Design a protein around this ligand. Structure first.
Ligand code: GX6
Lengths: 114, 370
């Protein structure tokens, strides 16, 4: 069950900006897996962002991104998404997807005012 | 972690179980803490030797994966549906966490008589998960979603209750030093045994004897289980170390109880049993030690006792017989098991376990696992 995962879509945005991240899955039955987004900035504690259940109807969010971010998936395309609006500088970090113990490499999100 | 102190109920026969709240609205179950399996498996229909089960139809957040899980083992078997739902751990967390759940509809030597739990919390590694290691484990769900370290620790006090600390080590649960031994293979909590000593005397066995197929740490096994050759050698050393008229053969194999005048306790004439574990530095070991009172276990005018050690086939299982002596630290982030002397592990004002170190491993191979 070699759970391989690869995120994309980060970049450098301004306050009030937006991004949409994706995560391509292979190795496992994506359609049957709980999928989670986590973030890690340097020098900080790891922080959960959002989880989604396998059929997509069940989704939970960290209070720090409730109503600013939205998690979604496409089972037919073995792809996980995260839409991120109202970006704040505190949102800066490496965002990654995790399932069953395993994670991809991550994608960088920077919200710089400078 | 103070919220997590004394969150376990039970003893070594009931099991140590945690109160878990599943679904919406929440359904309260009593869940066995099992470091020897990797599924969150609960009772899905009513059944003999249980009062509650989780009714998936009465949870509005429940989601079926549309497949079944099947585990045959030597004692027996269990079969359930696999789904997902929201859980809380009230003696522990505020928030609810989305996890996989197996709801048991059929089994054999699973729900054995006198259990108080109606499910199992498998806290071992992904590799044991069923139907496959892609079924995210409860603890891997909780680490990710709750933001805790990849560590938990367990103290059993039934030698009442105990503590499952998810996330760390609680200092008020141990005194003295933690000693850590490496996890050799992340499936079970498989650790390397280097020597058993009874009454000061080592058994004369190749250290390989104690690790084919595996030595593990399992809260979900009641007794100290030993490969038949090892068992037979522990029994022989225990009886020679004893010098007092013999126990019955029936005692040693679980089929007989030995009894005394509620007054003259049997603990003064039996030996210590010490299991040596390899330290993180391979040249060094440390020994965990159980007095008679943990392996000669009480069950009007007479107190009676069972032997707390049984034979196995392919495993040396460090179960509740031993973990009842120690604060046991499952440090998955550092690939090691830690042991400290449990302060609650005391009877009639005597400590029933000991930990000491360090000793030389210059006499044993560089690896005791085959
Ligand atoms: C899922 C699961 C599982 C099992 C299992 C364990 C148990 N365990 C107990 O009933 C129990 C009672 C008292 C104490 C104490 N102190 C601990 N454990 C029951 C059924 C199982 F099925 N969990 C463990 N650790 O080893 C026995 C197995 C069956 C198996 F598949 F080989 C694994």
């Amino acid at each position: 069950a070699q759970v391989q995962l690869q995120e994309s879509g980060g970049g450098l945005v301004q306050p009030g900006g937006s991004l949409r991240l994706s995560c391509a899955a292979s190795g496992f039955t994506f359609s049957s897996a709980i999928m989670t987004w986590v973030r890690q900035a340097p020098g900080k504690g790891r922080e959960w962002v959002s989880t989604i259940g396998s059929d997509g109807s069940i989704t939970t969010y960290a209070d720090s991104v409730k109503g600013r971010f939205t998690i979604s998936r496409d089972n037919a395309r073995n792809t996980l998404y995260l839409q991120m609006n109202s970006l704040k500088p505190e949102d800066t970090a490496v965002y990654y997807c995790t399932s069953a113990g395993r994670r991809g490499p991550g994608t960088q999100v920077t919200v710089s005012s400078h | 972690f103070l919220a997590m102190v004394d969150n376990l109920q039970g003893d070594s026969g009931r099991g140590y179980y945690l109160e878990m709240l599943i679904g919406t609205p929440p359904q309260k179950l009593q869940i066995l803490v099992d470091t020897g399996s990797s599924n969150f498996a609960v009772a899905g229909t009513p059944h003999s030797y249980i009062d509650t089960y989780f009714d998936t139809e009465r949870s509005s957040t429940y989601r079926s994966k549309g497949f079944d899980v099947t585990v045959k083992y030597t004692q027996g078997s269990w079969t359930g549906f696999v789904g997902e739902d929201l859980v809380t751990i009230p003696k522990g967390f505020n928030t609810s966490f989305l996890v996989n759940i197996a709801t048991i509809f059929e089994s054999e030597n699973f729900f054995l008589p006198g259990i108080k739990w109606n499910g199992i919390l498998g806290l071992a590694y992904a590799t044991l998960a069923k139907p496959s290691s892609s079924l995210e484990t409860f603890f891997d769900s909780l680490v990710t979603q709750a933001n805790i370290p990849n560590v938990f620790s367990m103290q059993m006090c039934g030698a009442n209750g105990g503590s499952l600390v998810l996330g760390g080590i609680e200092p008020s649960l141990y005194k003295g030093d933690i000693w850590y031994t490496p996890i050799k293979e992340e499936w079970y909590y498989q650790i390397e045994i280097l020597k058993l000593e009874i009454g000061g005397q080592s058994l004369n066995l190749d250290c390989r004897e104690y690790n084919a197929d595996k030595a593990i740490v399992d809260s979900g096994t009641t007794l100290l289980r030993l490969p038949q050759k090892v068992f037979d050698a522990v029994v022989e050393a225990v009886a020679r170390a004893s010098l007092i008229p013999e126990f019955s053969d029936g005692f040693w194999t679980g089929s007989q109880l030995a009894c005394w005048t509620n007054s003259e306790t049997p603990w003064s004439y039996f030996p210590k049993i010490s299991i040596y574990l390899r330290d993180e530095n391979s040249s060094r070991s440390f020994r965990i030690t159980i007095l008679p009172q943990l392996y000669i276990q009480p069950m009007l005018n007479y107190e009676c006792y069972r032997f707390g050690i049984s034979p196995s086939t392919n495993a040396l299982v460090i179960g509740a017989t031993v973990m009842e002596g120690f604060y046991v630290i499952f440090d998955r982030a550092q690939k090691r098991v830690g042991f400290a002397a449990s302060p609650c592990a005391e009877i009639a004002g005597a400590a029933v376990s000991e930990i000491s170190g360090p000793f030389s491993t210059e006499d044993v191979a560089s690896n005791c696992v085959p």
